[model samples]
Every structure is written in C-alpha cells, then in structure tokens.
Target: GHAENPLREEEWARLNETVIQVARRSLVGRRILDIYGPLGAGVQTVPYDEFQGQETAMVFTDARKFKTIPIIYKDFLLHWRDIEAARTHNMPLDVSAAAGAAALCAQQEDELIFYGDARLGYEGLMTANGRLTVPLGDWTSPGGGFQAIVEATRKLNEQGHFGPYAVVLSPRLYSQLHRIYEHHHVLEIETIRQLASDGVYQSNRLRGESGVVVSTGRENMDLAVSMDMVAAYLGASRMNHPFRVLEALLLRIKHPDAICTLE
Candidate 1:
C-alpha cells in the first residue's frame, strides 16, 4: 500500500495533513462542503443532466436550511456550475482528489498490448523516462471519462503496483474522467461490500490532493475521518512510494475523535 511515485506520495501526505489541520482549525464551525462530479454536491444534476427538475433543488436542501453545511464528495469532484453554486451560497469549498497512485494495471510478461496496431486505433504515450502510458478514447461525456480512468487504473493493477483507488479531483474533473473511461472494461467494486458494513453508499472527499472519502453522509463520520485514514495509509503503503503519501499523513493522527468529532 505504498506509493509507486514518490512525488505523488509526498504530496498526498503533506496535503492530507494540511487539509485536515486547516479544516479543523479554520473551517470547523464554518459552512463547508467538498464538491465533486457525478455525485457532486452542489451540481445536484448528473453531468448528463442540465440541472432541471428536482435534481436542482437537491443541491440546496441539505445546505439550504442548516441540516448540513456544504457538500463533500469522495474526491475533488466539482464542476464549473458546482463552483458557481458554492459561490452563490457563500460556501467554503474543499478539494480532495485521488486516493493514491501506484501500478494499477497488469499485463502478461513479454506481452505487447496494442495501441493503434489492431486492437486500438489510437497511439499510447511512452514517457520520457521510457514508461508507457495510454490516453482514454473519446467518450460520451463526463460519465464516460470516469470509466476510462478506471480502466487505466486497472491496467496499473495488472502491473502489480497496487495502491488506493483514485478519488482525487473536483466535480468538474470527475465528470470528465467518468466520461473518458466509458469505452474501457473496468469492473466496478462495491465500496460498501468491500469497505463499509451497511453496503449502501460511500463518500467523496474534496480535501486531499488525492483519495476517496470513506464516508459520504451522516452515521459514517468516524469511519470516514479515522478508520479511512488508516485504510488509506495501508492501501497507499502497499503501493509504490509515489502512492504512499496518504499513508504517511495518517501517522500523525493517534486519536480518531480528533478529526471524527469535527462538524
């Protein structure tokens, strides 16, 4: 669960701690929300939807009267409209993107996957460092992109550089990714089944430079704030160092309630 990329690893840990500390000290009592895409907070409507009908009101209900503050996704999943809504509501927004980085894909040894050869009519990118990478093909839109990125992640998994699942980005970014991954065949995992007990819905956090928020709604705050940190670290540490940033951040929090109790 360690990071494969040191730069990303360092950034995640540093930012995770920085965000938590800042959130606790600066915006503890203030109205705050971590907006994201797809399930983005302020952008109640899906990327496909044009903010019509009941979806539009859903964005305001929780924060409208004081039932809750702003919104927080598993990652930084805010869109242009989502930001506008936050601005309109005078809400302080947070951006958490990606859980961690690592080898998320695996391929047969001595095997060559086609980029534009016969399988894909596109070309994949090889890094200056000699590492090869691919771009997601055209998708329907935001939702499709998410799926493509997920596929790329799976490829990394195949490579044996496993790390935490990515949940980093704003609502706008999430939508873009969702749409990009539309063509790839990336299987979906039940976060609740593999992670939560209730098995209903998970959360998105727009605070970390990367990471998926463990919890989304009420009754799951402790799991999100405390247990998630440990889980993140473990997952991250198992990855390459670039993915261990989040793992390193959890090192400082000896007590769960320190962050769990925060509103």
Candidate 2:
C-alpha cells in the first residue's frame, strides 16, 4: 500500500543480476541502433531535433525543428516468496518467471522499434515513409539473399548514407542465407557481413520474409532512453515482496533515407 522511488540505489540487496542478464540476450534492436541517453526515468516526452540534410546549404526539413516522441514502457514483476524459498532450501532460484518477464519486455521493445504506432505518429525505420525500399529477392536462390542486401546497401550509398552499415533480417530469411553459395564456395553471410560492418542481426519481430540494410551512425538511427531496464522493489504484501522490471525508451530515425528495406 506504499509507493517507492524506482530510481533508488542498486546496492547489493536490490540488484537483480538475473533480470539484467536475461534482458540483454532477448533484446534485438537494442544492439542495432546506438543509444541516446539514460535521460532519466522521470522523462515522459522528449523533444527531437531534425538532422541537417546533405542537399541543403541548410534550410527546410533540413532546418532544425523540435518534435516529440513519448517514452514507451513495458513491465513485469517478480514475487518475493520465490527468492525466500530458494534461500530457505539453499537451492538455485527457479528464475524462469523473472527471466521470461525480462525477455518478454525486451521483445516488446524490439517490436516497438520495428513497427511503430501509426496512430500516435511514431515512425519506425522499416516502415517509415521517408526511408527507401529495395525489392526483396528469393533468398533461397543461389546468392539471391546476398544480392538483396547488396542492393539495399547500394541504394543507401547512392542516397549518401555510407558505412558502417547494419543489416537485420527475419529468422526465416536469415536461415535461408546460412546455406553456402555453390559459386563462391563460401558462406553468403560472411561476404554480406563485409558490406554491413557495424553488424548483421535477426529479429523475430520482422515477421515473415523480410530484412533491412541500414547505414548506421548515431546521426542516422539511435534509441532514446528515459530509463534502461531495471527492477524496482514494489513493496511487500505479507512475506511475498514484489518487484517491477521495467524500461522507458523510444526509437529515433533521424536520417530515414539511410535505411533501405528489402520487401
């Protein structure tokens, strides 16, 4: 029945290493985009400034104007009795629920990054209108998937988006790419990796048959964070202490043309 400051210090007692580790593995887009700020959890709405364009001597959409993006959130809880029982029996804590909670929140954040809410005017890189699109080819074809990425990078480069690039794909498309290309006697992924030096990754949130190549830099695409993931003690009811695992973040695609979707 009492409220607590979620920002309270993470001394030995409150630190949950379990949740932190699980959250890291489950996060997808987290690695793809550079992070902006741990701006503080108190931040609700952030003012975003426009990027200066290459075409401009400097004015228009290229001119600085402030827009806002809301800090989005996801949450989960851990029950105190679980920890008590683990200590009571001197047994390993069954942290599957806590792990699941962390993982679920991480996935949700990736989903938000990929598919923004149109109703709210939040634009995601893959779907955002200003971004470029390259036709996706049959990844199952020999060297076909590799070409798709090459083409995407070609498009971005032509638009003045240079490396270090990044590529993210659906699990299905990524697996298709794993097969060795007969002509080259090499794994297609390795060559593609060269084109996207920043990194190549998989995102289940991309749904079926899709992928993207992006020119990466803090100026092009970055994540604005009001809070990084953390678990806060939410007081105890009886002997069961409750903790909330939560984060506040937003996706920022400043140079949309720096991204090319293979669709």
Candidate 3:
C-alpha cells in the first residue's frame, strides 16, 4: 500500500507535458498581445467564484486617457480521448489544438477589436459603426484591392493611427490577393507585408469580403489569462478515465482608434 506507482507518475508527467506542448502550439492572440505587453505574468490559479467579475491586469491608455481594462475569464472542458485520437496516426495533437485555439482566440480578439463585442458571432465588421471601410466594388479592376488597402491606410494615417499595424483577412480575400498579384499585376506579398509589416493573418472564420487593421505596438488590446492551461487527472478507475484540459482567459480591446476595418 505504501509503494509508489511509477506508471501513474509517468502518465501524470506525460499529461502535464502534453498540456504545455498543446498550449504553446495553440496560441495566437498572445503573440501580438505579448508584443504590446498586455498578457503580463499570467495567473497560476483562478477561483471558480471570480469568473463573473471584472478585473485588471495592467494600466493602459484608452480613448486618449489612462484607464483599467477588465480581464474576463472563461473556461473550456475538452475530452482527453478526443485529444488522444487527435494524437494518433503520427499526427501531432498539439498542432491541431494550437491551430484551433489560435483560430478561436483570434476570432475573440477580432470580435472585440473590430466589433466591440466578443459575443457577436458571425456579425460582419462592416455592421459596426465608426470602422474605416474601403469598398473594392470590382477587384478585377487594376489595383482595385491595392487601392482600397492604400485608402484604408491613408484614413488611419489621417486619424493619427498610423504605422505599426496588423492586418487580418478572410481566406477568400487572401487567395484573391494571390490571384491579383499573379495575373493582374506585380503586387508582391512583400508589399502586403509592408502594409501589415507587423503581421498578416488569414482565416476562414473571418468574413471573406473584409479585413481589419489595428495598432500592433501599443496596448490597443489585451488577452488576460487568469489561469494558464493545465491537465487534471480525473482518476484511473474504469469508466471514469479522462484528463480535463482547460484554460481560463479574457480578451479586451482597449482603444477606440487603435483598430480600423476594411470592407
């Protein structure tokens, strides 16, 4: 009864490592947030009762004045066997989790930055007021897409939200750019990178007809992790086997002018 369980210990260690591996691979919003210093020293553990309250991770300037932005926390419960099945057949489960998490997180981040509401699922950013939009009525026209982006950038510049910006586009629009560059003219990815020199992302979840621009260097937004990802072993008993994969975090857009949308 006093003997240690090496097999149990090994499994626990493996699960722990798996969580970290998956978390790092699944992360995305944290990349730009970290650059802006919004995800600061994340919490080790968050009480279940505090999930409904608003809190701050740091101070930042919003609406031309300093203020404390709320850090909201939410949790997810993923089945261990699904992650295991995802890991089978030589496929790295973490990669899928990483990509999935990144996509979900990106969607949340974009929701707040572009629409000011994380719960506004499937609502086009164009529906939101105060966003800068450029209508590419017919991208088949020479330099139509390019001109639209240039115009969006120009408007941001006029509004003093210039330089060091990030751009996220829909997959269709990204492919459209590829075709535009391939046949219409010599629009290089390098040029696109110049407009979004900080980073460029393409997502199917994004509205295929639109794109978003936002400040990349300043604290224009935040992603607060009140509890970093972790795996908790339920038990080794029969019919009760499962490792709960979970994380608690929040995303907040702090600046009104820090983001602009292109339609």
TM-score for each prediction? 0.21, 0.81, 0.61
The top-ranked prediction according to lDDT is 2
Q: Which of the two, 1 or 2, has more lDDT?
A: 2
Instruction: List where candidate 1 sits over 4 angstroms from the true fold.
Output: 1-132, 139-143, 175-263
Instruction: Give the per-residue lDDT digits (tens) of candidate 2, residues 1-263.
Output: 33353222333233567778887878878777788898886777765666445865954443554445454334444455665565576655454666777888788778888998898787877788788888886667777877777777777778887788888988998888787655667777888877678888988899889888878788777888888877666675665556567788887777778888888
Write model 3 residue lDDT over 151-203, tens digit each, in one string.
77787788777677777777777776666434546753457777677777775
Q: Poorest 10 consecutive residues of model 1 by lDDT? A: 102-111
Best to worst by TM-score, what's the order? 2, 3, 1
lDDT computed for candidate 2: 0.73
Question: What lDDT does model 1 reach?
Answer: 0.27
All models, RMSD in angstroms: 24.9, 5.9, 9.1
Every candidate's lDDT? 0.27, 0.73, 0.53
- lDDT (tens digit, per residue) of candidate 1 on 56-175: 544443321111111222222224445355557766443343322111110110011111123322111110122324354444333333444455455545654343322223343333
CA shift of 257, model 3, Å: 1.3
* Candidate 2 structure, TM-score to reference: 0.81
